[PDB]
Amino acid sequence: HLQEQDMENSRQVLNSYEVLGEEFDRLVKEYTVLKQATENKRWALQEFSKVYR
Amino acid sequence: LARLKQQTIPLKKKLESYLDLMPNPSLAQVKIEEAKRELDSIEAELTRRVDMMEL
Known part of the structure; x- marks a missing residue:
């Protein structure tokens, strides 16, 4: 019922x-x-930041 | 119960592309202006990290 x-x-x-x-x-x-492209750029930026660390 | 929770996942996944928009088409266009602007900006926001890596 929920x-x-x-x-x-x-x-x-x-x-x-x-x-x-x-x-x-x-x-x-x-x-x-637009948000799918936005998350595609955001995940690449986060992955590059993790690689740089 | 199991099949309802299984079919919830695609329904909720498609619903997730709706909650980011307020029910006002005028304000939707007003903020889709900056949505296009931020897409064009983050197509350039990845540029300077690559530039610092290459230089």
């Missing part, structure tokens, strides 16, 4: 994001791509 409550809350959050429209879906995809 588990499908958590999945119901997650699906409600996803639906509330889907209310905004396809422009916000494009924003979701764009920020996902």
